[model samples]
Target chain A: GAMNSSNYAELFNNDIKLFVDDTNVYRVTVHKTFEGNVATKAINGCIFTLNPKTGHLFLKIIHTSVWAGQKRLSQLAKWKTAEEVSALVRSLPKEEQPKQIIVTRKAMLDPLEVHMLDFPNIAIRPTELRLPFSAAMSIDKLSDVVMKATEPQMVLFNIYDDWLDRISSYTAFSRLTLLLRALKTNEESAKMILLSDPTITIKSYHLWPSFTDEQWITIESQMRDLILTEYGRKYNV
Target chain B: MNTVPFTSAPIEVTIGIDQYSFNVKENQPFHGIKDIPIGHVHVIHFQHADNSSMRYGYWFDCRMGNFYIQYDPKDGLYKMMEERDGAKFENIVHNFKERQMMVSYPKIDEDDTWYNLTEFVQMDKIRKIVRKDENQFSYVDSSMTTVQENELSDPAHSLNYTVINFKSREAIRPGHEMEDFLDKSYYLNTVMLQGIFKNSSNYFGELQFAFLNAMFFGNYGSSLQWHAMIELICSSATVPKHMLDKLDEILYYQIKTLPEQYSDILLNERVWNICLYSSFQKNSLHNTEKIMENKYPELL
Candidate 1:
């Protein structure tokens, strides 16, 4: 009476495909799929695809910004139930398939349930993806990991902090140093991606006052210098 | 606890066009979750082929130091490139690599006592120093009280109190042993004073503590975060600008003169010299010192 992993068997039955871009390189594609109307939308399809040849994993998350500016909304709205989505994933073609796929939604579905299900013909394992600012203080090893990679790799960090305000200049210097270490080691080893425009302006109407322009300006410069030092036009060309 | 095992050796690090060769060691154990293992300290001793200039550069966790060098096709040589500490590494390796005539530095003896000095001074020891009588002295406050509802209740009256203290600058007197410990050595001080500065209220106190603590531990780093935090705190409406200036003045004089008279008592304990005085605000020092000095009152 209920759908289970068996229903998804047909998805895994598709053609197996292999693509080789680089010897030590791994490609991850993040697909964010949303289902529903503005009032009762369900967000899902946050899946990670680790290309078949290399064991490296990639996970991407997409959010529905149009749903923003709406008030008192529940974080749950699903186009397809978790069972249905897993089934759908199983049905996709196998070429360059992820060694592991991770699925998450906006406050809906049990994360543990999504992780534990047995998908036919696939092995699942849990791991952490290291990023620059994530371990801001201990970036030395991050530099080591990136430098040791035999081929080029790209990592996108999820920015959660007021990146500019939270870290000490010394910490910033260390972060820059580690990045420079990685870049200098292998010029093509890694690259950084800026997801959206990083610019900010003070909110005119304040429930509470905000930081001074001078303070913001200073932090802006600190962050700007590091970005420019690593990926700015001068460094790139 | 048993000392961790470590070994060092020379190796080559190649990253695309960049290639650097240096000595590496076993990584040090992690001190905290957020800290990188101290790892093997790779001290690369190199001599220039052209001028025979001999100098040394060191790296923590040599694995990470691998990115400091690159190969230039035109020059057909492994060139030292750069980063934060990496750039400094690049400078040291540049000549030796380009010239292709590198002579390594001899292994230096490990002075265990010098290494142990970087260990953070314990808080318990700091409390013990404040408890001693030979460490404190008395002074009269001749300045007038400008604020209303004054404790003395008279506008131009003075108060007398006994004080015990140590300041950052005091740790580095010309004849002091700490000066030699801190001399030109950057990493030593930077690691030791990591979280010590946030203990103060105003930026001035923080910077004073930072420099002094950096001096105390003989460490260093970028001041961007410090500068921002100070600007945010000073510009806030909660604290009057002039009040902060007064606090700055009070702290400056307190740090400068308080240690001179009390150096004998203060200098003996590392934490007391770096922490106790700058920790609390001026208003709380009298009661804090009184309680600490009264309780432990004398050295064991």
Candidate 2:
């Protein structure tokens, strides 16, 4: 699953954009400045200017410095950053400027930075961060997150053999089955991706580019049945 | 009341052209802390000459150590047999294809996710692999001794064994067909739940008859039983005129969405007559006595 995140990140990095309006948008280019392997340095800085509503996105970036500790200084720093982006928007004619500026980042945001954006009716938020290999995920919560999302959703299931071992009961298997059905049925437009391991690449059984649109659903149903039959036999349900 | 045979020793069996030799004792049990009786059905993959493979199973039958069954797609050859079913040999009995294997029937789970029944294995593989030495081509490599291993490593084993994976069926059906079938089923089921047949007490019973009739027509060339059942049920007092018309509409809609081959039989005159006979009844006028009084009662 690590490969999946990196693959997604690489692809996502190539094509990033900010929408000013339906037709008016700016394509943002990002380069990784640091090797933030763990979560701490996930996102360093975002650079933008609002003076000329159509001004090119500049590299002028800022820091929520560690020394800016007290609420007074911390609040002041956030205030300046928010004003810079907000002031640019207000200067433009009402119709020319975006009604709202919503910033979405893959990494977590500083609370102070988020609170500051509240004054101008602008919003800043983080994106869904997935682990490379996951032992468990709540299907209900997953549907809640994806279903309400405004953007197109692509869910890649990177299931490992050990993942089945963790759900070793009929009840667990049954619940997961409902979850999978819900995920697929609830979102007709959602693209469900089944990522296969290198070792188990049997043409019919393996998932991905090898399977046609028809085969994926069949393989999914087959896999689900196979899991239930095997697990039900094991659990004697 | 399902039971599995007790087996502490290993079992050797051949499925079609492949040989599977594995210990039954080592198999992981379906329940308990390794209970001595039941275990998971062992799956053995057979590589065809075309590079495609088929997965076969050895299920534990309580009376027999193992029961083997393989469905041959060509001639409806469902090869199934158990030694305890009066067969002297331990392998699949050719004459016992019709005999019932002593085994546990799969339990029904309402929550069980199911799809339209379709072939799991399909083409896009080799059929046979021929070698210069007849003895060299065996499914299992038990004969590969130290000396044989070195000799057969390059030419014999590598050539046949490595070519196991190949293409096969895309899905249960074509995307449109599956979508259409499932969507129609869901819609019709929802309609049923909403009590579209509330006035007719026999609607559910007669609907099943119609569905089974169509299925029979699809599977067998004759829908004789279907016609007989539909006629018998429709002639009774409990059935309504609107029910028969609605059933006709539902059957036609369902048959039309299915593969063309399965639908043609339902469109026949004799089969269609069973559903069409009651279309004239606007009220409860066509009672059972009225039908019996008529000279041409069968036509009615």
Candidate 3:
């Protein structure tokens, strides 16, 4: 049946349980459970989530004109039946497949409230966000170009730690500081690690995973030292 | 018929003009989508702006003077006649001034006729005079064989039976009231012609009338969609590369409400050639020749 307000009651039933679960592991009744798949008939983006204990499924669709047109323009293999959809999804090149554009931290809250409470974190702003250049320009010109084009929206999130000590608006700079602190405590490697664009042919030891203790130790120490020494790199550290 | 009530009066009218070197980058519009020439309105004050928003930079400085617009019977000339009557406008007739192109208003007190020779040096108008008539002329080739003779005899080529007419470098020229208008220093000294090439086969012919109309008057900021605007600009006999870059920028940014696929129909090799002409090729070639001459003093 097509989704509607009236169908909210049926969401509690286990029939759509598999569609909602985002957990790393979940038991599935092959015939009873439905795998999350892109519905071919509709050219819209949808997300399905469910409460494991209550078996209540929640569905959300982000509606945009761009998304609607994208569905029509895209001839991706998922537009077929369930078997074909599942097969294509499994067969896809990891990069070619649709990626999850993260939303607010409240989305992460539901699971965090239930698990991993000790390793505290808070919602952070996206890496790239801007108010656009509206200063000195006419309201009409600004409205037509920046506001109408990007359609910027309020992004929300939650973290275990209150990193908003001296911060103002939710910015990428503030989030980077918090992220670096979190990563420092968790990673054990002290081995020298380097970051480079994967596409580039220049080889470095840090580009690959650190399996040995010496490599890990050297990388971890170097990263920690770099983070501590560079005050200018606070934004993207 | 007064069927539709006016919701709003026109606050400002913008002319979409892509100033290109040798080809039409985009079409120009006179009044909205109707493709009516600005000359149709005896008092059209047009200023060319730089960006898509029509927001800044004054390209040319004189206004669109009074001129003859080829009238179509379908779009009635009644409104025009009414405006002319009310304004008591002096016709600054174009290409056909010898035919008494404009009418002047008579002064009731002194019985002196007044003509608005103001467009020539107006600070807030276009910069060019469209033509100087016999004052300056380019080339006109003579017909050769029987076929050429037959073509030359066509009604459009009436003067010489040579199927050729004089072309010009300067787009605008001082009209009958040049002496009166020339005194104002505000007038733009140079003529930048937005020449619409109606014929495809003729030399220097590279644009259609529709494309010319669209380029000068397109509402790129608020009204028209980029997809449609690109389609219009691509109609030129030679598409300019900078225009293509602008089109590509629009697509790359996904600036429109809904982005369309960048199809080959709009961005293939043929269109690419036209765009190159506008962007870099012509300028680069000229620069190279100039550099070579400077470097080798002996090589003339």
Winner by lDDT: 2
**lDDT (10s digit) by residue, model 3, range A125-151:** 121222111110121221233233333
Between prediction 1 and prediction 3, which has the larger lDDT?
1
Local distance difference test, each candidate: 0.29, 0.30, 0.25
Candidates, DockQ = 0.00, 0.01, 0.00
State the lDDT at A64 in candidate 1: 41
Best by TM-score: 3
Predicted candidate 2 versus true structure: per-residue lDDT over A1-237, tens digit per residue: 112333432322322222111100111234554584432221122232221122222222333342133344333333343444444455546555554343322221332133233333344433343321111222223324333444322232222112233433333333333334433332221223233434423343212234444654565675565546556766899
Candidates ranked by TM-score: 3, 2, 1
TM-score for candidate 1: 0.16
B18-116: candidate 1 lDDT, tens digit per residue: 012333222222111111224322222222233222222211223333323333447433334324464554454454445433323222356332222
* Displacement of the residue A16 alpha carbon in candidate 2, Å: 98
What is the overall TM-score of model 3 with all chains considered together?
0.20
Please give the distance, in angstroms, between residue B24's alpha carbon in candidate 2 and its true position after superposition: 27
Instruction: Report the error of model 2 at residue A134, Å.
Output: 92
Assign candidate 2 its CAPRI class: incorrect
